[PDB]
Amino acid sequence: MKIVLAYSGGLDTSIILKWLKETYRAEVIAFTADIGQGEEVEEAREKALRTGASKAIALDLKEEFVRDFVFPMMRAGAVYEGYYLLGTSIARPLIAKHLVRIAEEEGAEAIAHGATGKGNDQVRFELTAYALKPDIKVIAPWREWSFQGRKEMIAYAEAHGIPVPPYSMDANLLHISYEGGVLEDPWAEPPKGMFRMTQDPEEAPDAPEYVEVEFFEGDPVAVNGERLSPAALLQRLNEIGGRHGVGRVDIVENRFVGMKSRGVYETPGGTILYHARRAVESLTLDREVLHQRDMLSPKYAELVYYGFWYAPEREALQAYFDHVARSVTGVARLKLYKGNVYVVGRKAPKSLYRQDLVSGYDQKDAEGFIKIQALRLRVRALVER
Amino acid sequence: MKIVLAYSGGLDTSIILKWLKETYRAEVIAFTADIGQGEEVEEAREKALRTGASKAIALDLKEEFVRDFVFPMMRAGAVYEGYYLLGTSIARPLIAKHLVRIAEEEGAEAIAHGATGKGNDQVRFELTAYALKPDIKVIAPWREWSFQGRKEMIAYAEAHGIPVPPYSMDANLLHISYEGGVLEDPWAEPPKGMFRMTQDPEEAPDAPEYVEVEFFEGDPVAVNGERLSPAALLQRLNEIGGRHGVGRVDIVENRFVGMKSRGVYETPGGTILYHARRAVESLTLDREVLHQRDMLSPKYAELVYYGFWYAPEREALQAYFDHVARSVTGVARLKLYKGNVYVVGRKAPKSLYRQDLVSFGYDQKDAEGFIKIQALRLRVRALVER
Amino acid sequence: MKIVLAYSGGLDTSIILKWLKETYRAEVIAFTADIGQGEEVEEAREKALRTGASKAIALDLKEEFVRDFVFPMMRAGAVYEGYYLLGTSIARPLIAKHLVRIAEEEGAEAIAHGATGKGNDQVRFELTAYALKPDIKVIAPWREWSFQGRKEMIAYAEAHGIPVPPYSMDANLLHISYEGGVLEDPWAEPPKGMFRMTQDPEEAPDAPEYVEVEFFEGDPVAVNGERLSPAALLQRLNEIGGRHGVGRVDIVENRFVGMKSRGVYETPGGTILYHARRAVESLTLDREVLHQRDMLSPKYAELVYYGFWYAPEREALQAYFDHVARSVTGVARLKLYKGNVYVVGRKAPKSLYRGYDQKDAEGFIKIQALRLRVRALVER
Amino acid sequence: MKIVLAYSGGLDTSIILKWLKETYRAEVIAFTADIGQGEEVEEAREKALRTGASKAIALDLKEEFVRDFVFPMMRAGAVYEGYYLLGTSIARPLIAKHLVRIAEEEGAEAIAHGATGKGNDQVRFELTAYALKPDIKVIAPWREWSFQGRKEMIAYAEAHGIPVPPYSMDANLLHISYEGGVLEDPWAEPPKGMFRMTQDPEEAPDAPEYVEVEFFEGDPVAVNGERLSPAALLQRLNEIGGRHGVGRVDIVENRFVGMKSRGVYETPGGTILYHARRAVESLTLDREVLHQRDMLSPKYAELVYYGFWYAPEREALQAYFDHVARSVTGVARLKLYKGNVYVVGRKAPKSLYRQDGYDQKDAEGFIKIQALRLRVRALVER
């Protein structure tokens, strides 16, 4: 039996690697992916080989992540419950896709992940695993084992000789999320110095910095004139935005599994891309199209949050969002200043804006429009007798 | 005949007042409402008599504005095209309402407004008027007169003796709108020194400031522990959020009548109220209710933006939103800092949040069955594709 | 330990009653409700006592069903996947509601139902059970016992003294449902003679029959001029509609739990009410209100179908639907003929049926066409 | 000056042809199109020349009408206010499209139509015209002329040598609508023998007829095993369903311009296609996809109804509907009997149906999770 584990190199997935061997007595192929966590994956790959893995793969997936996941999602204008930019949600699908491809190639019947039983990640990993390979077996150590608390786990580690050391966190090119620990009290403010991706607004530059993002077809292709690849472009905007402390969100979200959770997120580049995109859409999209797209954004957002990336519903909606996003061509000019992003200007080759209509229709026309529109309201008032 | 005019004391409405006399030879009843423009509505009232009005009425409508218009709209989480909080939109209905009411009391055949022929305000003024009094006659001078240019208008104003003088403005307790002039070029940043309700970020305090807002039933009822009337509460939050430069929006919006239009708005209090409400909703509203409400907000928003406030569709959605808002009870804690509004805390007497369910009534193995059932249709799909 | 059980008197719920006593060494309180199944609920009640029930309750819930579940759902104009009028779905919340109530009165810690492990009813039963009483324990024998098959269940029944007698069914005042057996092949037409609540359209009367339905506030209050209580009114329209073979549906539906299921439904009375309601709305509802309402109905139908009746989302939408329904006041006139229902007339006290001139229309057109022209010009 | 006129050969469009020449001092290019009205279009074309057109054009647009308008719309499951299958609405964009095409080729600066100045049809003609040629000049005689009565119009027609002749109708391959006259009383049942496209159910065959419709990719491609082109297939189903009196609707609909109007429609072929399509989707479409689609259908329906066919919104939705419809491959079996259509069977190569992935225990976990938020709500309400 072979098991492909999403190995991160940390304490838990390390414990998990030992646990899969003793419990299933199978070969555990460890898989670590670089998606922008700011970590040397080869260090995790080597530690994997030492922790017992029979094989350990480490792939650079920054470009695929941004190109095939972050961007398609951004074109939809996806935002979960008002502020969540789905940093962790779009990542999981990519990883599960690789676990299944690897198992397929290694002749492994199962894949494993270290997501707990109380979160969305288990569902995200699994829903995409079963969607891509229906007969794949999935092992979720957190839902199967007996450890009743941290203490027991440290001991099991030492017992197996495994390296050992507030809140937990997830990071990638799109963001860093912080949850648990002192964060569980929704009336409690995130502790000083918790953030890592963005600088503290209070320590941000005293002079605003302007940035321009060009969109060609629904996707950002250049920053301040320099053409950048998807992963390269997101990286650049993280640097520029992070320096100004942009993209901080503090929310109590609704998990798919039934309960509420207090989360804190920092998405510098993503927050700039969010506003830059809408700025360009303000000139390139027709009113009615925009109004319809916006009413569907929320649904697409929960589809991603819940883990339905490789679900026919999302791919259906994606056909709609992509059709609309195709017209988003132009440039956005934003002003970054102490934790904030301000749209200050935008332009587009095929802008629908013309200061002459506000500088083919005249006064009288507006009158008839009003009459026709008011008819049903007048008949109503009259009938209300 | 009698004509009730929405008179503001400004140059254009003064010109209109004279025009209504000269053209219709009508007795003109001027109406000025203080909805928080920061003007001395009484001065406007006296000016109207000075300009020819046969009667001048000045009312303080701050409270009615925030309690019967602003609040109901906020409950719905209304946001036009992602950023506009509808400061100008919700005010129009209120004014048309009183114009129509004053016209009936005064036995006046018609009412008149000063909205141009290229905007949405005319639609907003008239849809409300026709909805409340189907038999009402409406006169829109901007659409009826022959003037062409500010040159001609000023001449005509100079002629009749009406006192004479970069962008156009509109203000009330909720916000201040800026558009036209140097603002017409979408690629041009707004000019330094334009904002009047909000301090500029670069000049905001160096220390962050915390503020708390209590919601009892969908409506904000207090700030930092002090109970305040709707109008006084918005006022208080404009001051607090204003000194920090909170609530500035710069967008190109889609009009109902014209094409696109570049607008700049400052809504200090409203912006604080928008994030506070959602913070209290994050504890008091059910997941599926919240997701559904958010999918209807955009529609409610365009209804308000287009002028359909006293229209059956908006009253129907209002029933849905009022039903959901009744649960929003609690307190939000925000950190204001240099143009930004950060939610740092929230609490509610009937909070649906349970740390016990997240920390390390919930059985981990239940999730596996949940997952397998959810995954079924997806596995069948793959299998059929083979 | 006590357990309240949804008892129908059938073979399975009878076997279940025995199973519960033995498996949980519990005192079983049987509950049978008359919601229009066309059975003598008192015989099920007596049979439960014979089978071992420590108590048996039988209630006539036909009025509560129609007025508190069927009617509110109809105000929403709810239709699941284009055709299903939700007969089974709106009934379960009511049963589970009473199971929990009776359990509270009897000091029982658990309730039980006979829904299978792969169906949707188990969800409907339990979703409302947990929503009304979060501390309740639910026992679903189909998911907990070992029975390897029919033959085995039958032998179990015989051994216990339960009397042992081609498709599953479910009936109530709203409809009768059929599935399984020959019906499991979506390419096979339902067998001749399967239908019970409605006459075969090929055997329907040679002359069409007219019917009038009055609505006062979203709810039908009379038929052909005679005021009738909610249950009485549904009964009457089932008679009139049934005799003509009206209300037959044959669909392949998407289940909440399983995959796809093939079902046949007959809802004579509710089908008439469906078209009668929309006929009245056509004169009383505002165009924009109607369009928004119809865009929300599907979501509501889905909530009902899944079993989210006592869920906050359905209740939120209900406030909207009810608000709209308040204006539905008037009379719909229909013509029934061999399986079909035809709206033939409608009138209302506050009808919006029968301002501007031709020049007004041109301006309307110009303003509406503006963004289109700009787009065309911009495509240069 | 040249004016392309949507000419039908009737009294009013003939009168309009004369009115246009004199009022605008221009020549008129008459355009008549056959979209299934059952009239000989070539005769209207010759009458146009006789009436004064400098050029009369007559085209057979049946296939384009069904292939590019009817079909695209049906894939969206479009139904206006519960029953209207939009027979009049999807036909206008097609006609206006050709008026603007002929205008560009003939060097005409303007086009004209005979829609009334108080109805919805005018909006349909003009919205697509302006959307396709923003600079086109549109002349609507009914909104512009000074005729004050029917009588005066007859005298004008007689004066100009134009031959002169309880409800008004409109027909094409999809349906035939009826309105006005005795039909204006919403409480009055339509007059006997009014229907033309469908036999009265009382006179329909005593024997039910089974029909099988094959869908390949969201569009019907065969009836009872016989492959048929789009127009040929709609014609076939009109004959079959019509013989049984299928597809009659009687509704008071909400207008885009004006209030409400009582209309009666007969759409035999389209009604069969409607159920046949859903029958195949019941086996080919994913649950969540189907639910989403149905929630967008109403919106699409009003776009088509109001006349926003060549509008970006409609085309954006069409991208969604076409994506979904592509999976609709299979065959639907329907039973037709005295005015009704009954789905009695459906099959598909990629059916997602297996009379047959989880066990009982799975079902319980599912319930638990789904019920959590509800239980929490109850505990909180204490």
C120 labeled part of a ligand binding site = yes
Say whether C320 and B323 touch across the interface (CB within 8 A). yes
A211: β partners: A334
Euclidean distance between the first and final Cα of chain A, in Å? 79
CA B170 to each of CA A361, B68, B98: distance values in angstroms, whole numbers, following the listed order: 25, 20, 19
Joined tokens for residue B301: 């928003």
CB-count burial class (<10 Å; 0-12, 13-18, 19+) for C105: exposed
SS3 A302: helix
Q: What CATH class is the domain C167-380?
A: alpha beta
Domain C1-166: give its CATH architecture: 3-Layer(aba) Sandwich (3.40)
Say whether D373 and A312 touch across the interface (CB within 8 A). no
A175: β partners: A172
Q: Is D311 on the interface with A (CB under 8 A)?
A: yes
Report phi then psi at A72, rounded to 5.
-55, -40
Q: To the nearest 10°, report the CA torsion of B104, B110, B114, B116.
A: 130
Neighbours of A195 (CB within 10 A): 20
Q: Is D153 on the interface with A (CB under 8 A)?
A: no
CB-count burial class (<10 Å; 0-12, 13-18, 19+) for B321: buried
SS3 A101: helix
Question: Which stretch of DSSP H or E encloses residue B215?
Answer: strand B209-216
CB-count burial class (<10 Å; 0-12, 13-18, 19+) for A7: buried
Q: To the nearest 10°, report the CA torsion of B155, B157, B163, B165.
A: -50
| Sole residue written with tokens 């409270």 | B63
| Alpha carbons D142 and D139: distance in angstroms, whole number | 9
C333: β partners: C212, C345
From the list C182, C186, C196, C188, the residue with the least C-alpha distance to C261 is: C186
CA B149 to each of CA A36, A358, B118: distance values in angstroms, whole numbers, following the listed order: 58, 14, 14
Q: Which residues of A325-349 are buried (b: 16+ CB within 10 A; e: fewer)?
A: bebbbbbbbbbbbbbbbbbbbbbbe
- The DSSP letter of residue D191 is P
| Alpha carbons D75 and D98: distance in angstroms, whole number | 24
C178 labeled part of a ligand binding site = no
- CATH number, span A167-385: 3.90.1260.10
A327 labeled part of a ligand binding site = no
Mutate to test the interface with D, among A292, A352, A361, A364 (most CBs of D within 10 A): A292
D213: β partners: D223, D332
C12 catalytic? Reply is: yes
CA C265 to each of CA A164, B314, C174, C251, D350: distance values in angstroms, whole numbers, following the listed order: 63, 37, 10, 8, 26
Residues with Cβ within 8 Å of residue A40, at least 6 apart in sequence: none
CB-count burial class (<10 Å; 0-12, 13-18, 19+) for D105: exposed
| Alpha carbons D367 and C139: distance in angstroms, whole number | 13
Domain D167-382: give its CATH architecture: Alpha-Beta Complex (3.90)
C167 labeled part of a ligand binding site = no
Neighbours of A231 (CB within 10 A): 20
The one catalytic residue in B168, B227, B294, B354 is B168
Residues with Cβ within 8 Å of residue B16, at least 6 apart in sequence: B5, B7, B112, B114, B141
How many angstroms separate the CA of residue D328 from the nearest CA in chain B? Answer: 14
CB D134 within 8 A of CB D163: no
CB B85 within 8 A of CB B175: yes
A290 vs C contacts (CB less than 8 Å): none
Q: Give alpha helix (H) positions in chain D.
A: 11-24, 41-51, 62-65, 71-74, 92-106, 121-132, 141-144, 150-159, 230-243, 268-284, 287-306, 312-325, 360-380
CB C325 within 8 A of CB C297: no
- CATH number, span B61-89+166-349: 3.90.1260.10
> D312-325 vs A312-325: helix axis angle to the nearest 10?
150
Say whether D132 and C376 touch across the interface (CB within 8 A). yes
C265 labeled part of a ligand binding site = yes
Joined tokens for residue A329: 């061509």
CA C73 to each of CA A381, C87, C140, C317: distance values in angstroms, whole numbers, following the listed order: 29, 10, 27, 11
CB A100 within 8 A of CB A111: yes
Which chain A residue shows the shortest CA-CA distance from D130? A360
| Alpha carbons C97 and A273: distance in angstroms, whole number | 50
Which one of D288, D352, D361 has the shortest CB-CB distance to B384? D352
What strand order describes the sheet that includes D55-60? D55-60, D27-34, D2-6, D110-112, D137-139
From the list C309, A344, C305, C193, the residue with the least C-alpha distance to B185 is: A344
Q: Is C164 on the interface with B (CB under 8 A)?
A: no
Joined tokens for residue D89: 């609405």
Q: Is C320 on the interface with B (CB under 8 A)?
A: yes
Neighbours of B105 (CB within 10 A): 11
CB-count burial class (<10 Å; 0-12, 13-18, 19+) for B213: buried
Residues with Cβ within 8 Å of residue B215, at least 6 apart in sequence: B221, B276, B277, B280, B328, B329, B330, B331, B332
Q: Where are the domains of chain B?
A: 1-60+90-165, 61-89+166-349
Say whether C374 and A364 touch across the interface (CB within 8 A). no
SS3 A119: coil
Helix/strand/coil (H, E, C) string of chain C?
Answer: CEEEEECCCCHHHHHHHHHHHHHHCCEEEEEEEECCCCCCHHHHHHHHHHHCCCEEEEEECHHHHHHHHHHHHHHCCCCECCCECCCCCCCHHHHHHHHHHHHHHCCCCEEECCCCCCCCHHHHHHHHHHHHCCCCEEECHHHHCCCCCHHHHHHHHHHCCCCCCCCEEEECCCCEEEECHHHHCCCCCCCCCCCCCCCCHHHCCCCCEEEEEEEECCEEEEECCEECCHHHHHHHHHHHHHHCCCCEEEEEEECCCCCEEEEEEECHHHHHHHHHHHHHHHHHCCHHHHHHHHHHHHHHHHHHHHCCCCCHHHHHHHHHHHHHHCCCCEEEEEEEECCEEEEEEEECCCCCCCCCCHHHHHHHHHHHHHHHHHHHHHCC
Joined tokens for residue D254: 């909400």
CA D14 to each of CA B59, C224, D153, D158: distance values in angstroms, whole numbers, following the listed order: 61, 50, 11, 11
Which one of A259, A322, A379 has the shortest CB-CB distance to D259? A379
Say whether B316 and C324 touch across the interface (CB within 8 A). yes
The three-point CA angle A12-A17-A21 to 5° equals: 140
> D287-306 vs D312-325: helix axis angle to the nearest 10?
150
C89 labeled part of a ligand binding site = yes
CB A284 within 8 A of CB A327: yes
Please name the method used to determine this structure.
X-ray
Mutate to test the interface with B, among C309, C313, C360 (most CBs of B within 10 A): C313
Residues with Cβ within 8 Å of residue C380, at least 6 apart in sequence: none
C92 catalytic? Reply is: yes
Q: Is A323 on the interface with D (CB under 8 A)?
A: yes
Which chain C residue shows the shortest CA-CA distance from D205? C202
| Alpha carbons C149 and C156: distance in angstroms, whole number | 11
Say whether C367 and A360 touch across the interface (CB within 8 A). no
CA D209 to each of CA C174, D175, D214, D219, D222: distance values in angstroms, whole numbers, following the listed order: 30, 21, 17, 22, 17
Say whether B319 and C316 touch across the interface (CB within 8 A). no
Residues with Cβ within 8 Å of residue D232, at least 6 apart in sequence: none
CATH topology classification for B1-60+90-165: Rossmann fold (3.40.50)
Question: Which stretch of DSSP H or E encloses residue B151?
Answer: helix B150-160
The residue count of chain A comes to: 385
How many angstroms separate the CA of residue D309 from the nearest CA in chain C? Answer: 11
Question: Which stretch of DSSP H or E encloses residue B253?
Answer: strand B248-254
Residues with Cβ within 8 Å of residue A299, at least 6 apart in sequence: A317, B295, D292
Question: Which stretch of DSSP H or E encloses residue A50?
Answer: helix A41-51
From the list A302, A256, A51, A54, the residue with the least C-alpha distance to A157 is: A51
Mutate to test the interface with D, among B289, B370, B386 (most CBs of D within 10 A): B370
| Alpha carbons D252 and D214: distance in angstroms, whole number | 33
Report phi then psi at D214, rounded to 5.
-90, 130
- CA dihedral for C308, C309, C312, C316, sign (positive or negative): positive
Interstrand relation of B110-112 and B2-6 (parallel, antiparallel or unpaired): parallel
| Alpha carbons C55 and C15: distance in angstroms, whole number | 16
A121 catalytic? Reply is: yes
| Alpha carbons B255 and B121: distance in angstroms, whole number | 10
Which one of C254, C258, C316 has the shortest CB-CB distance to B324? C316
Neighbours of B356 (CB within 10 A): 10
Say whether D339 and C337 touch across the interface (CB within 8 A). yes
Neighbours of C58 (CB within 10 A): 19
Mutate to test the interface with B, among C118, C320, C321, C371 (most CBs of B within 10 A): C320
Resolution (Å units): 2.3
A359 labeled part of a ligand binding site = no
Report phi then psi at C152, rounded to 5.
-70, -40
Which one of B257, B312, B373 has the shortest CB-CB distance to C367? B257
Neighbours of C203 (CB within 10 A): 9
Question: Which stretch of DSSP H or E encloses residue D219?
Answer: strand D219-223
